[PDB]
Design a protein around this nucleic acid. Structure first.
Ligand SMILES: C#Cc1ccc(C#Cc2cn([C@H]3C[C@H](O)[C@@H](COP(=O)(O)OP(=O)(O)OP(=O)(O)O)O3)c(=O)[nH]c2=O)cc1
Ligand SMILES: [Mg+2]
Ligand SMILES: [Mg+2]
Ligand SMILES: [Mg+2]
Length: 539
DNA sequence: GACCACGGCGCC
DNA sequence: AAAAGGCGCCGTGGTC
């Protein structure tokens, strides 16, 4: 390429180098742009940012996030990563995409700029003819990246002093548990070490081993194994409680408070847009899509996520979402009838599980049933079901049989989906998002059958993902106009932040936009709650 | 210090 | 553990 002076022309492709991967924390080391066999390198990267109309290139969102941090409204535009991911969602890294589509991901801004332009040309040409993938790029993914940038740069408030106080309390409980565990073992050991614990449990206490680990074939000490051993020795229960507290303390209570950004006073995750096989987003550094909620200590941690003073959080969550999608994809009359009648599959399974009438099902009962409902849908074995519910094997077998016989077309849809996946080599969502599954043709049954479960799940989980993404795209401009904020997406859930005076109107609006995102053969319902913290905002 | 495979486990 | 699918992070034991 030929060196030309900064600034580049309009529509040029950017390349930039960060001191670290997280845009909210990085120093902008270098910045460059490329167009028309020219490369323009910027003397002063930060000042050079004021010269761009949009971030166009590999990882566009990240530079946009950094620009937003510095008070610059630089929106992300075309990004070759998005094109590659739509062509084949195994395209997840710039290193991989470069190797596959025509260059090398280096550590130099100018080469990265030239690389962005080359890759965009090639990938765009491969997208020609693919009208449905084109529709997803222009109407969903590309504008979505703008929305995600604003979400990352805005972040979410955390009650730091609360978490610190909670730490000290949980530290003391952990000490009680480990001390009791050592007493029962007769000696101390590293309780955090599953190799040491296995020896204690199965060699010293002579407990029966239940299962083996995958790669190394050791005797498993997982929660499920321990659960099976709960009656066998008093140490087991203590170990389960220890596992829960230390998981929560080391993963959330201790690290979160140290991640508060000095400028914003808030927590800033990254919303990774090309990271899953199904079209879901992922969240990292920190992951805020896996904040605890299910156990009492977990709920206490979730409370730490709060609104700015004078504002309220609004949480909206699609009802039974993948079941609704499955009703649309499969066309099962019975399943459609369920939703047109306003019924609840989770609640109904809960009624069976606990042996109570539908009217007498508490939220806890309904929620334990959700894990059962999807486990079965996506292929859980009778054996596992019987062990999870502590019922006889043949009772678990019966539940699974009735489950599919009551929704007769679901199995037909699965069979069609797999058949089509064998011929084409890929499966797709309602909007044409593809996932390649070559192992549908594998000659080893266990491999083929795992491939099959991956394959028929993808259209369902992926269609739900498409709907959520499209809804964020439609919702975002409305919120800006109302002076409200989009903070987090947790798969089928959105968390917003609204001025207290408008929290209610924002809630109503958001609900309507999400339920009407894309009319199906069944209604989409959204549960919405409002509160001063994340826990109270989901009731 | 930084990486890794692994088992394990938090959320959807 | 197990014929659920999809993620990212943690500590240990280990290397470099
Ligand atoms: C307390 C509690 C609690 C919270 C969440 C779950 C869960 C879940 C799962 C969700 N999913 C998919 C299908 C779900 O429809 C989708 C969204 O999860 P989620 O919002 O929790 O459930 P869903 O929408 O079906 O019902 P909802 O309670 O009406 O929201 O993610 C799974 O594939 N497997 C699961 O185990 C289980 C218990
Ligand atoms: Mg839901
Ligand atoms: Mg949800
Ligand atoms: Mg170490």
């Amino acid at each position: 390429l030929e060196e030309a002076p900064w600034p580049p022309p309009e529509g040029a492709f950017v390349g930039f180098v960060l001191s670290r991967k997280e845009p909210m924390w990085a120093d902008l080391l270098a910045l460059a742009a490329a167009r028309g066999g020219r490369v323009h390198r910027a003397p002063e990267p930060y000042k050079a940012l004021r010269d761009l109309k949009e971030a166009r290139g590999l990882l566009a969102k990240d530079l946009s996030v950094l620009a937003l941090r510095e008070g610059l409204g630089l929106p992300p535009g075309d990004d070759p990563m998005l094109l590659a991911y739509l062509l084949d969602p195994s395209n997840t890294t710039p290193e991989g995409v470069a190797r596959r589509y025509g260059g090398e991901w280096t550590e130099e801004a100018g080469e990265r700029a030239a690389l962005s332009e080359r890759l965009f040309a090639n990938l765009w040409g491969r997208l020609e003819g693919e009208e449905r993938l084109l529709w997803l790029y222009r109407e969903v993914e590309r504008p979505l990246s703008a929305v995600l940038a604003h979400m990352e740069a805005t972040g979410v408030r955390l009650d730091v002093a609360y978490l610190r106080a909670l730490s000290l309390e949980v530290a003391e409980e952990i000490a009680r548990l480990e001390a009791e565990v050592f007493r029962l073992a007769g000696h101390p050991f590293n309780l955090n070490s599953r190799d040491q614990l296995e020896r204690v449990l199965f060699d010293e206490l002579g407990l029966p081993a239940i299962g083996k680990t995958e790669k190394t074939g050791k005797r498993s000490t997982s929660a499920a194994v321990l659960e099976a051993l709960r009656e066998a020795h008093p140490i087991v229960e203590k170990i389960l409680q220890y596992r829960e507290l230390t998981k929560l303390k080391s993963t959330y209570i201790d690290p979160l408070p140290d991640l508060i950004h000095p400028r914003t006073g808030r927590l800033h995750t990254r919303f990774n847009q090309t990271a899953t096989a199904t079209g879901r987003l992922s969240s990292s550094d920190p992951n805020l899509q896996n904040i605890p909620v299910r156990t009492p200590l977990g709920q206490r941690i979730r409370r730490a996520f709060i609104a700015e003073e004078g504002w309220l959080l609004v949480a909206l969550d699609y009802s039974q979402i993948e079941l609704r999608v499955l009703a649309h994809l499969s066309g099962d009359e019975n399943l459609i009838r369920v939703f047109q009648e306003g019924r609840d599959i989770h609640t109904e399974t809960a009624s069976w599980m606990f042996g109570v009438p539908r009217e007498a099902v508490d939220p806890l009962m309904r929620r334990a049933a959700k894990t059962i409902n999807f486990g079965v849908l996506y292929g859980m074995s009778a054996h596992r079901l019987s062990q999870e519910l502590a019922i006889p094997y043949e009772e678990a077998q019966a539940f699974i049989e009735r489950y599919f016989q009551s929704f007769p077309k679901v199995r037909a849809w699965i069979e069609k989906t797999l058949e089509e996946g064998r011929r084409r080599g890929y499966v797709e969502t309602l909007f044409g998002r593809r996932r390649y599954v070559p192992d549908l043709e594998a000659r080893v049954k266990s491999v083929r059958e795992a491939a099959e479960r991956m394959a028929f799940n993808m259209p369902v989980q992926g269609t739900a993902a498409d709907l959520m993404k499209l809804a964020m795209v439609k919702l975002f401009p409305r919120l800006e106009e109302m002076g409200a904020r989009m903070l987090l997406q947790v798969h089928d859930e959105l968390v917003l932040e609204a001025p207290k005076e408008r929290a209610e109107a924002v809630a109503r609006l958001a609900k309507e936009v999400m339920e009407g995102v894309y009319p199906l053969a069944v209604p989409l319902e959204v549960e919405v709650g409002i509160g001063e913290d994340w826990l109270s905002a989901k009731e």
